[PDB]
Amino acid sequence: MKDKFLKHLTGPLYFSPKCSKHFHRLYHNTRDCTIPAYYKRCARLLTRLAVSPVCM
Amino acid sequence: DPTVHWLFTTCGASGPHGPTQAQCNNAYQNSNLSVEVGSEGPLKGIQIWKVPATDTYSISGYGAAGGKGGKNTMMRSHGVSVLGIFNLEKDDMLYILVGQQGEDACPSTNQLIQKVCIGENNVIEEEIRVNRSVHEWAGGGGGGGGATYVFKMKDGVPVPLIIAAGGGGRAYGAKTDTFHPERLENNSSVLGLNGNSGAAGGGGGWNDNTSLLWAGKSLQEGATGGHSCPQAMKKWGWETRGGFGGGGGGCSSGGGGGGYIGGNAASNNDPEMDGEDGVSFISPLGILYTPALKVMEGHGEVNIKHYLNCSHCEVDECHMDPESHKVICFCDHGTVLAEDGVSCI
Amino acid sequence: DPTVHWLFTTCGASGPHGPTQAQCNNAYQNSNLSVEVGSEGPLKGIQIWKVPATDTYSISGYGAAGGKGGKNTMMRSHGVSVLGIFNLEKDDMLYILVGQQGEDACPSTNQLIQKVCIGENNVIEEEIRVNRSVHEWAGGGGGGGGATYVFKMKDGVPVPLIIAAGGGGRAYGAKTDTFHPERLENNSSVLGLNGNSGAAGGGGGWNDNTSLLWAGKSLQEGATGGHSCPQAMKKWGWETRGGFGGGGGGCSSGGGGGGYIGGNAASNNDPEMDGEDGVSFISPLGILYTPALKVMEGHGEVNIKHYLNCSHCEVDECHMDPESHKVICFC
C-alpha cells in the first residue's frame, strides 16, 4: 500500500544483508520514509544507499 | 511516549544570514520546542537547546541543498543527512545551527538578469564560445548549501556531535547531473578546515580563518553565508549568496557547500564545474546509525527523538509500528520472529 | 530498450507564466527528449510531445506545491501525484502543461516587506489585536500551486488524460499543518470548473470562464497564474503571484490550488485559512496505479515510460532485465 509507490519512484535496486540492515533503518526508523509527504526524500535516500559499494 | 520528537528548522530564515530570536520564537509557536538564539558574536543564529531529560537520543542532521545554475534545468546538489545515536544528560546545552539553502541563479527580480534567465539574452554563451571561459560576463552560478551543526560547549571550546554537509552549488553550464560519493569523518583528530575557493566560494568548515568575503565562514567565525563573486556585482545586477552554515557564494562557477570540511569550487571561473559538497561528521561519543546520503532539496533540519533502546530482542535492530504502539523486532537472513517477539525462526 | 523514460519539467521557468520554446530547448539538450512550446493563445507554455510507439505507457504526473506563508515556518502544501496506465498510438501529439510552484510570501526584495517578514514589524499582528481583520495592510499568503496536465485533441477538442492537482497556498496564520484528504476524480462528465476566489485567488480548473484578475486561469484559457490581491498591490507592495497551471493569487489568505477542479480560496480575508487543494483527475481510458498522494515540494513534473506487463502472468510483480525478458514469474 506504501511500497509499490516507493518502488515506482525508486526502481530496480538490490540490497545486500548489511545493506538490508541499513535499509530497514531508513525504511522504518527514519521519518523521511514513515510519513507519506516525504517519500521523494525517502526514495532519494534509498537510491543513494544502493550507490554505496556496501550495497549489491 | 515514543512519538515525542523535537524538530529544529531554519526558523523561516534564508540566505547568507541565519535566524534571529524573534524568527525562532515565531517558528516554534504552540509546540514542544523552545530555543534561545544568540543575537551577537559568532553565535549569531545558533539555537541553544536544553536537554529535558537524561536519555539516549537519536539526532537526525540534514544539510541544505545548493543553488540551481543559470540554465536552471539541471537538478540542484542535494544536502546530506547524518543519523547519530548519542547520550545526553540533564540540563545539557545543544547548540544547533540549521543549514540554509544557497541562493539560486534564476529566477531574479532584476529585469536585465531575468531577461538573461529566459534565454532572450545570451551574452554568456557567446563569451563561452569565444574565450572558452568566463572572465567578463560572470553568469549566475548557484549558491552553496549550508551545513547543519549539532555541537555542545564543554569548558571553553565547542565539541561537534552531528555535522550534515551542505549541497554544493550548480554551475552555469552543468551538463552532468552525476554526484560524487558522500564523504564522512568519524574521527575528531582530523581538522575541520575550510573548502578551497577559486572564483566562486568554497564551503565553510569547522574551524578555519576566512579572508574571503565570498567564501563561506567556518563555525568558529559565525558561519555566515559567503557573498557572491566580485565580478557578479560589477557589470551585473545579480548575486547568489550561499546559505547560512558555511555555504559559499556563486560566481560563474559553482558555490561550495559547507560541512566539517568545506566543499571545493573551481580554481578558475569554469562555467560548468559544479561546487563540491562538504564532508559530514559523526562524533566518537555517538554511534553512526546510517551512512551519509544526499536527500535534502531545501533548507536543512534537525530531528531529535528518544532512541528506541531495543536490545531486549535477539536482533540488535527494531522499529516502532505506526499502526500498533508495540515495538517490532525483525529478523534478517530470511529468519522469522518467533512467537516470543525476541527470538528468530 | 533499457531505461528509456522521458521527464517533462518546467524547463527552468517559475512563477505564474509557463516556459517558452527557448527554455524548453535549453532544458532538453543532450537528452532523448525534444518538445515544441506553444507561443500564443491558450496553449502558450504547453509542451508538444510525439508518442514514439504504439504501446502501453505509464504516465506519472506530479503537481506543484503551493507557496509558503508570511511567517514561512510551516511546510508548504504539497503537489499531488497521479500515476496512470494508458495505451498510446504512434505519432500522437500529447500536450503537457507542467505545473509551476506558487510564489512564497517571504522573502521579498522590498526592505519594508523583509522587515515585516523577519519580525521587526508587527502592524499585521497589532491589526489583529485592534480589529482582527486584515484590510488596511494585507497578510502573507503563498500562491497556489500549478496543476500538471497531460491531454490530447480529438476533433480539435482537448481530452484530459492525466491531471494532478497543485498544492494550496499557506496563509499568514498557518499555525497548523493539516491537509484535507486528497481528492481524485475519475469520471470526466463533471465539468472542470475553477475554485472559489474571494480576497485570495482560487485555483484554475480544466475549462471555466475566469473574470477575476487575481484568480488563476483554467487550461482552456491559458492556465496562467493569477496576480496578488489589489489590497496587497497598493500601499503594501506584495506580488505573491500563483504558479503556472491555475495557481491562485496570494493575499492575507492562501491562494487556491490548480487542478481539474480548482482549489477554493477564502471568500473573506481570513489570515489563518490556507489555500485549499485542487481535484486531481485520471482518465477513464487509463488505469489508476496507486492512490493519489501529496508528494512534491516544488515545480511539478511528468515521467513517461513504457509500462511493464507484470500482470501478463500469474505473479503480479515483475522486474525485467535491461536486455532480456526477466519478468518475475517462474515457469
- State the DSSP string of B36-66: EEB-SGGGBTPEEEE-SS-EEEEEEEE----
Query: Does any CB of chain A come closer than 8 Å to the CB of residue C319?
Result: yes
Q: How many helices (H) and strands (E) would you count in chain C?
A: 4, 13
> How do the residues of chain B divide into helix, strand and coil, expressed in percent and rounded to 5?
10, 25, 65
How was it solved? cryo-EM
The cell for C20 is 517558452
Give the residue carrying C-alpha cell 473573506.
C268
Nearest to B232 by CA among B332, B134, B139, B115: B139
The CA-based angle A52-A55-A56, given to 5 degrees, is 120
Contact B154, B164 (CB under 8 A): no
Phi, psi of B44 (to 5 degrees): -75, 125
Query: Does any CB of chain A come closer than 8 Å to the CB of residue B83?
Result: yes
- Residue A31 and residue B317: Cβ atoms within 8 Å? no
Whether residues B134 and B204 share a domain: the answer is yes
SS3 C221: helix
Overall resolution, Å:
3.2
If phi over 0 gives left and psi between -120 and 50 gives alpha, with beta otherwise, what is residue B38?
A: beta
Report helix angle A17-24 to A39-51, nearest 10: 160
Distance CA B68, CA B177 (A): 12
The cell for B322 is 505506526
Whether residues B261 and B317 share a domain: the answer is no
Chain C residue numbers with beta carbons less than 8 Å from the beta carbon of A40 are 295-297
The CA distances from residue C86 to B222, C151, C160, C282, C285, in Å, are 55, 12, 12, 10, 7
The CA distances from residue C263 to B173, C73, C170, C246, C275, in Å, are 38, 22, 13, 9, 7
Strand partners, C184: C280
Q: Could you list the residue range(s) of the whole structural domain that residue B63 is in?
A: 1-307
Whether residues B242 and B315 share a domain: the answer is no
Identify the burial level of C287 via C-beta atoms within 10 angstroms of its C-beta, where 0-12 means exposed, 13-18 middle and 19 or more buried. middle
Q: What is the CATH number of the domain that holds B331?
A: 2.10.25
Domains in chain C: how many in total? 1
Contact C241, C143 (CB under 8 A): yes
Contact B101, B67 (CB under 8 A): yes
Contact C170, C213 (CB under 8 A): no
Chain B residue numbers with beta carbons less than 8 Å from the beta carbon of C44 are none
Give the residue carrying C-alpha cell 560519493.
B181
- Residue A37 and residue C319: Cβ atoms within 8 Å? no
Whether residues B232 and B339 share a domain: the answer is no
Distance CA C32, CA B260 (A): 39
Nearest to B253 by CA among B94, B142, B330: B142
Whether residues B320 and B271 share a domain: the answer is no
Whether residues B323 and B300 share a domain: the answer is no
Whether residues B187 and B317 share a domain: the answer is no
Total residue count of chain C as it appears in this document: 331
Q: Residue C235, CB half-sphere, CA atoms under 13 Å: how many?
A: 4
Shortest Cα distance, chain C CAs vs residue B79, angstroms: 15
Beta carbons within 8 Å of B125's beta carbon, 6+ residues apart = none
C115: nearest CA in chain B? B23
Chain A residue numbers with beta carbons less than 8 Å from the beta carbon of B81 are 32, 45
The CA distances from residue C329 to A6, B190, B282, C310, in Å, are 21, 52, 44, 9
